[PDB]
Design a protein around this ligand. Structure first.
Ligand SMILES: [Mg+2]
Ligand SMILES: [Mg+2]
Ligand SMILES: [Mg+2]
Ligand SMILES: [Mg+2]
Ligand SMILES: [Mg+2]
Ligand SMILES: [Mg+2]
Ligand SMILES: [Mg+2]
Ligand SMILES: [Mg+2]
Ligand SMILES: [Mg+2]
Ligand SMILES: [Mg+2]
Ligand SMILES: [Mg+2]
Ligand SMILES: [Mg+2]
Ligand SMILES: [Mg+2]
Ligand SMILES: [Mg+2]
Lengths: 88, 119, 101, 73
RNA sequence: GUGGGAGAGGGUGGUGGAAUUCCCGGAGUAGCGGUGAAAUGCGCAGAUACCGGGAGGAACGCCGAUGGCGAAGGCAGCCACCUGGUCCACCCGUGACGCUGAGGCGCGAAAGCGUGGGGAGCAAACCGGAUUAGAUACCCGGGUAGUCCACGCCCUAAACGAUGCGCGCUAGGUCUCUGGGUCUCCUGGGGGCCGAAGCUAACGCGUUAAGCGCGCCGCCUGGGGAGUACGGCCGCAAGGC
């Protein structure tokens, strides 16, 4: 699983400021975490579809936030991406 | 020929027949009767009367071995399970106890159609 | 790592010699798999509701270690290899849920 | 039927998760190794459900029976 | 976000006891079985019934329901690991980031197909017994594919609540599952029943709408011919759209 601690180090490394948790980056951050975990898992448990839908959704919500991002501040966006590993 | 004195009586009832087995305390059968044995063939083989007769036969035959007391053990719901348990009590043979040991799986093999339809 | 209550039921006909040997192996194992023994209890011989391995009884060992999840199965895997060892139930810990209180 | 005494009333406070407490678990088992219903165990949905999981562990360990023979018939 | 809760939600590994079949030994003898009756069939190469030992396959009794989880198909022995959804409280963060969704992609009971494995019980076909005017059936005795595992495929269904998804509004009573509270009951999420207003051809529905409204998708347009023909796309095929 993802440890409370593990999770926190994420929020820190992304929050727009002290006490920031739900900013459109932190979230895109948190999701990337869950995605890379799930993605991993399913790499091994190929027949575990019920889990895969959870992913198909996670990847969805992310793609949706990033969209919003690239529309209200193409910088934070263009900044978040390069900061993460989305794109190529 | 062995003088077993105290034994164990198995009553295997069923809708089609009632076979009775008398064994020693270890479980090795001494004697045995049944619908067939007693003379009834086919259908009446399993009536409760047949049961009665069969039950009694098992006792008598087992009496020679010197049998006097015995623990009855039942299996099956067949028509006739009771009479057997009755006769076996009124055969002199001291019926120490009675038990239901009818086996039942914890859901194992697909029963024959006649026994499914349970869904 | 997490708290797992370990259970073991081994042959009741053991001489002190043969016995200590097995317990020794239980440690050899538990230790080999990052298992810190928070505690233990040894009820010993108990009348089983049904015979196990033809034997009408069994000697019980109850622990409570704290170890890496990624192990446990291996732990029990190994912990079972022994012959005198008849059962191993590595249930995970859980704070009690009282009732009629 | 069921109107006996409620296998819970006649008992004190106890950890429903204790899978070694044969001396209490046993009480929840029928005349046979069958788990008693709520109308007899007097427990609640949640309670009864945790019991079950317990009595089942007890059975694997060997402290509780999976089945017993009926006496008298 | 933080703190909490329930669950047969999914995947992997391990494992428990009951029963069935088979083999081994013991003890034991003439039948067992099966039916409305019977018979085929099994049994003196010793069956059935009984005790002990083993092998193996598949399924999980009680708990258990008016129950729960899931988007659907569907999911219940137990343990660990891996993993999805969801609910309540706190009102802490972002600041309309929303809803629906043609195409697309994925999932999708059973049967069925391909390769390999497995095969205890069950059982299309089939081989027999019986019933019958006949009996290519219902009942009985056998039995192969299959039912099981893996990998790949098929993509159907009374795939049903025969009720597309989301949101707002419109009496209550009662039962229940799970959370929070000042825990006689209030408040939230889910499952039932009776019912206001209202709706409806009627039956019924009725805060879990089939009510009152708004958004978006899909679909219908008398019956037979016909889910057929042709064409196209998909499939190894069966065959699907
Ligand atoms: Mg605020
Ligand atoms: Mg602001
Ligand atoms: Mg399918
Ligand atoms: Mg299939
Ligand atoms: Mg095949
Ligand atoms: Mg058959
Ligand atoms: Mg047949
Ligand atoms: Mg409600
Ligand atoms: Mg409610
Ligand atoms: Mg009215
Ligand atoms: Mg109604
Ligand atoms: Mg027409
Ligand atoms: Mg068709
Ligand atoms: Mg083609």
């Amino acid at each position: 699983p993802i440890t409370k601690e593990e999770k926190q180090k994420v929020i820190q490394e992304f929050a727009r400021f002290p006490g920031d948790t739900g900013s459109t980056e932190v979230q895109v951050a948190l999701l990337t975490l869950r995605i890379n975990r799930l993605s991993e898992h399913l790499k091994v448990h190929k027949k575990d579809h019920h889990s895969h839908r959870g992913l198909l959704m996670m990847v969805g919500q992310r793609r949706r936030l990033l969209r919003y991002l690239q529309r209200e501040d193409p910088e934070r966006y263009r900044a978040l991406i390069e900061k993460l590993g989305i794109r190529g | 020929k062995r003088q077993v004195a105290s034994g164990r009586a198995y009553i295997h009832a069923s809708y089609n027949n009632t076979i009775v087995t008398i064994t020693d305390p270890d479980g090795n059968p001494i004697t045995w009767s049944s619908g067939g044995v007693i003379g009834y063939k086919g259908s009446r083989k399993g009536t409760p009367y047949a049961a009665q007769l069969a039950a009694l036969d098992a006792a008598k035959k087992a009496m020679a071995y010197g049998m006097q007391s015995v623990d009855v053990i039942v299996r099956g719901t067949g028509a006739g399970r009771e009479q057997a348990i009755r006769a076996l009590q009124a055969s002199g043979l001291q019926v120490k106890s009675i038990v239901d040991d009818t086996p039942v799986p914890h859901n194992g093999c697909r029963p024959k159609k006649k026994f499914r339809k349970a869904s | 790592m997490r708290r797992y209550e370990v259970n073991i039921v081994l042959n009741p006909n053991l001489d002190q010699s043969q016995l200590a040997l097995e317990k020794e192996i239980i440690q050899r194992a538990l230790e080999n798999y990052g298992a810190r023994v928070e505690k233990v209890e040894e009820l010993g011989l108990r009348r089983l509701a049904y015979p196990i391995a033809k034997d009408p009884q069994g000697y019980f060992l109850w622990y409570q270690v704290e170890m890496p999840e990624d192990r446990v199965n291996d732990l029990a895997r190994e912990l079972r290899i022994r012959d005198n060892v008849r059962r191993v139930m590595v249930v995970k810990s859980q704070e009690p849920f009282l009732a009629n209180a | 039927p069921s109107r006996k005494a409620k296998v819970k009333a006649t008992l004190g406070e106890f950890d429903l998760r204790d899978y070694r407490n044969v001396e209490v678990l046993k009480r929840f088992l029928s005349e046979t190794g069958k788990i008693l219903p709520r109308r007899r165990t007097g427990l609640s949905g949640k309670e009864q459900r945790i019991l079950a999981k317990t009595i089942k562990r007890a059975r694997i360990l060997g402290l509780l029976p999976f089945t017993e023979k009926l006496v008298r018939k």
